[PDB]
Design a protein around this ligand. Structure first.
Ligand SMILES: CC(C)n1nc(C(F)F)cc1C(=O)Nc1ccc([C@H]2[C@@H](O)CCCc3cncn32)c(-c2ccccc2)c1
Ligand SMILES: [Zn+2]
Lengths: 266, 298, 76, 175
């Protein structure tokens, strides 16, 4: 049973991954129901890999990333293969559609330490921390990416590039009070008209807050009223005072105890 | 010890319940004690209700002449001041929550009900009086608690009132202090009609030793929010509503002056004084903050 | 058969009922025992409000149970 | 690394739970409970907290998932916009029992928090500590440990007034 399963899986994966994936996914889906569910003897370290690869090839990225991350923690599989699985998980998470599960996956990948030595760690850090991803980093990621994963719409605006542009706009929302169309276009490396159209669409759909003054060609983000800003800055100053006092009392304990004792008397 | 009050005596509670002394008297319950956690939960729930009304339930016990409250739990009702109790959703929720809390260690039983009157004082309306009358007629004891989450923010002190009604047909003999409470025009008739059918217990708060230690440790970091409050911005719709109500009351007072309960001008003056004093307090807080922080030019 | 009945406040009533009695019958039994009219009354079993009419044994008499009782105010 | 905002209601809940259990059982005993809050981006805020039911067999603690699910339904009935965040316990530094209970809780949410309150303390600062789970490889072995987070006390007007009134508990107005 196990030998037949291994032979069929190997031959099918080779000749069927040879660029007719529809029959491969159909056969896997049909046979998976009655596979075994309990086989043991290292047979569990190939079914999960094949399942994750199929899920990646069927344009569903977040669940494939979850499977790769789960596989990355297995003690039996070698260090190099675990690192490859983690790299695939990072790529799939980056390429996945935006969502709550994607945000938690990004948080988990950032919390992971082994990602630090990966080639996409910079992009992971920028995506998680809401920074601006530059064109050169995007080009490097595209070069590193496999040809299959580059899903592009026929009219243009490849999915990854559109997601990066929207992320750049949303991250610039956190950095500017108001920005003109020319400077936004220079920041996003797109024409000013396209920048205006994308910003207006994002504002209409509710993803980001702001309003566009077309006569001046300026997009306005949040206002940060003066009195609430005053409240926030007063809170920050008092927090600084508290932290400084804690640092003082954690360095010269006897001196600060003596000073506190004399504080009541004086 | 201070934690002694936290000890629940099943035998003593059963003996007190089976030897009910509140039947012979009518003003038997005169003191109402509330734990710190119960008060905080009540206040936060009433505040998070917003402008609408919310209502929950209260779990406690009785010690002789006083009524002690240990916990409070909200019940959904979808809030929104529905007609009354529930489409049976809350009816199931009360029993479900009490049963679930029984198997954890919350072994106390219900003692009353609380609800919010956001912006129009702390009193029992006609429906509230009927509800409390019905509850006391069958399940005893029971106390009503009314909170004002908006006036709490506006005045800087909690607006909490614990009440208990009188049996049907009983006429209480005078003894009416009747301290002044500002009440809008659209809710004054109910307060006037239903005012002698209930009395207000004297409410006090208590806390445990660990609670006291934790609060005195927490103040060392919580002193910032007092100095960064800015109460003049969080309460503006309330002040606008107060000014509208005051203008209507002034119009009624002028109509009474032109015509031929008593001296509505005095009541309007008291309302205006309260609103203006609150506004000036809010302004002088900001003046103090500016003097402290904006003038210490390096 | 006999089934202590407990309310939210904590009062328990020792009441005598028959296995063949219906929910309305238990309601009027409670009415005679305590005094609550049989419209300001809601019995809840195992976190479930009984649809009156539905007899009782079905639900599940199982002897000494404790049907949870909560008051109501009809309309007013 | 996520910014954490605490609420004094959670601390009051934990302290009352511990005091109640100690008074009921005659001797101090540790308690296990759950937290509730909202996560916005990387900003985690805790608002309320209920208690969980647990059992001990041999030397291991197991949480009743059925009771947890019933309580989850009950609290979703009332607080519609609030969600599960983590668990809280009373004690000192984290222990292998705490690591086991965290592993158990991790089957419910992705990255639950962990709050620890110390009733018996001698320091000057608040004994509340917040941890999060981090999985690492040490000497070729996979172990999940704790990482401490820095929390700030959240601001709310009603909470501030209530806390100040409770702390103070004491003939003009300007006064
Ligand atoms: C203890 C509770 C559950 N209860 N027990 C019994 C009794 F039948 F047993 C009866 C009840 C019970 O829900 N009463 C009640 C009555 C009226 C209101 C509303 C009602 O007028 C609508 C306008 C607002 C209002 C201002 N003042 C009372 N209300 C509420 C209520 C209060 C806050 C939120 C939701 C509902 C509850
Ligand atoms: Zn009311």
């Amino acid at each position: 049973v196990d030998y037949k399963l291994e032979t069929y899986l190997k031959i099918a994966r080779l000749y069927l991954e040879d660029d007719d994936p529809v029959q491969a996914e159909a056969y896997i889906n049909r046979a998976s129901l009655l596979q075994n569910e309990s086989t043991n003897e290292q047979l569990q370290i190939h079914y999960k890999v094949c399942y994750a690869r199929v899920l990646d090839y069927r344009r569903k990225f977040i669940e494939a990333a979850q499977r790769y991350n789960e596989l990355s923690y297995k003690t039996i599989v070698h260090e190099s293969e675990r690192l490859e699985a983690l790299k695939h998980a990072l790529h799939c998470t980056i390429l996945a559609s935006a969502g709550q599960q994607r945000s938690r996956m990004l948080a988990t990948l950032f919390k992971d330490e082994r990602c630090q030595q990966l080639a996409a760690y910079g992009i992971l850090e920028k995506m998680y921390l809401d920074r601006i991803i530059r064109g050169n980093q995007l080009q490097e990621f595209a070069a590193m990416l496999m040809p299959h994963q580059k899903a592009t719409t026929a009219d243009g605006s490849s999915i990854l590039d559109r997601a990066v542009i929207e992320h750049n706009l949303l991250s610039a929302s956190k950095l500017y009070n108001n920005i003109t169309f020319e400077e936004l276009g220079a920041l996003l490396e797109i024409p000013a008209a396209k920048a205006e159209k994308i910003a207006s669409q994002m504002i209409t759909e509710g993803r980001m807050n702001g309003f566009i003054d077309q006569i001046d060609g300026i997009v306005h983000f949040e206002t940060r009223e003066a009195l609430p800003t005053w409240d926030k800055q007063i809170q920050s100053l008092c927090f600084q005072v508290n932290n400084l006092l804690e640092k003082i009392s954690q360095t010269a304990p006897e001196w600060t105890a003596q000073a506190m004792e004399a504080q009541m008397a004086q | 010890s201070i934690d002694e009050i936290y000890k629940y005596d099943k035998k003593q509670q059963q003996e007190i319940l089976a030897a009910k002394p509140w039947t012979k008297d009518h003003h038997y319950f005169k003191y109402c004690k509330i734990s710190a956690l119960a008060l905080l939960k009540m206040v936060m729930h009433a505040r998070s209700g917003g402008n609408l009304e919310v209502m929950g339930l209260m779990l406690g016990k009785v010690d002789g002449e006083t009524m002690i409250i240990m916990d409070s739990f909200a019940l959904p009702v979808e809030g929104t001041e529905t007609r009354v109790n529930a489409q049976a959703a809350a009816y199931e929720y009360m029993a479900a929550y009490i049963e679930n809390a029984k198997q954890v260690g919350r072994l106390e039983n219900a003692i009353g009900w609380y609800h919010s009157h956001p912006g129009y004082g702390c009193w029992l309306s006609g429906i509230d009086v009927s509800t409390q009358m019905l509850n006391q007629q069958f399940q005893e004891p029971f106390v009503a608690v009314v909170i004002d989450p908006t006036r709490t923010i506006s005045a800087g002190k909690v607006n909490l009132g614990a009440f208990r009604t009188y049996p049907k047909g009983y006429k209480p003999p005078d003894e009416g202090p009747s301290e002044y409470q500002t009440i809008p025009l659209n809710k004054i008739e109910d307060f006037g009609v239903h005012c002698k059918q209930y009395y207000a217990l004297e409410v006090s708060y208590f806390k445990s030793s660990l609670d006291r230690k934790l609060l005195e440790l927490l103040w060392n970091k919580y002193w910032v929010n007092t100095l960064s409050s800015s109460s003049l911005l969080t309460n503006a719709d309330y002040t606008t509503g107060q000014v509208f109500d005051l203008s209507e009351k002034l119009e009624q007072s002028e109509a009474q002056l032109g015509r031929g309960s008593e001296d509505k001008l005095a009541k309007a003056t008291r309302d205006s004084c309260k609103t203006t004093i609150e506004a000036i307090h809010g302004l002088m807080s900001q003046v103090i903050k500016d003097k402290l922080f904006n003038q210490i030019n390096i | 058969m006999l089934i202590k009945v407990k309310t939210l406040t904590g009062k328990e009533i020792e009441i005598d009922i028959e296995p063949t009695d219906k929910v309305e019958r238990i309601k009027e039994r409670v009415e005679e025992k305590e005094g609550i009219p049989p419209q300001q009354q809601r019995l809840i079993y195992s976190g479930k409000q009984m649809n009156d009419e539905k007899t009782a044994a079905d639900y599940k008499i199982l002897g000494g149970s404790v049907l949870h009782l909560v008051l109501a105010l009809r309309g007013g | 690394s996520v910014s954490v905002a605490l609420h004094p209601l959670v601390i009051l809940n934990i302290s009352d739970h511990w005091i109640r259990m100690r008074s009921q059982e005659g001797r101090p005993v540790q308690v296990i409970g759950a937290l509730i809050g909202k996560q916005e981006g990387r900003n985690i805020e805790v608002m309320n907290s209920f208690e969980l039911l647990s059992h001990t067999v041999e030397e291991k603690i197991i949480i009743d998932k059925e009771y947890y699910y019933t309580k989850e339904e009950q609290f979703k009935q009332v607080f519609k916009e609030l969600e599960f965040l983590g668990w809280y316990t009373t004690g000192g530094p984290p222990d292998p029992s705490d690591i086991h209970v965290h592993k158990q809780v991790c089957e419910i949410i992705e990255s639950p928090l962990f709050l620890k309150l110390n009733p018996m303390t001698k320091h000057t600062d608040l004994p509340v500590s917040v941890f999060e789970s981090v999985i690492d490889i040490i000497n070729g072995e996979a172990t999940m440990l704790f990482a401490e987070l820095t929390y700030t006390l959240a601001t709310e007007e009603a909470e501030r007034i209530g806390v100040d009134h409770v702390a103070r508990m004491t003939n003009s107005t300007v006064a």
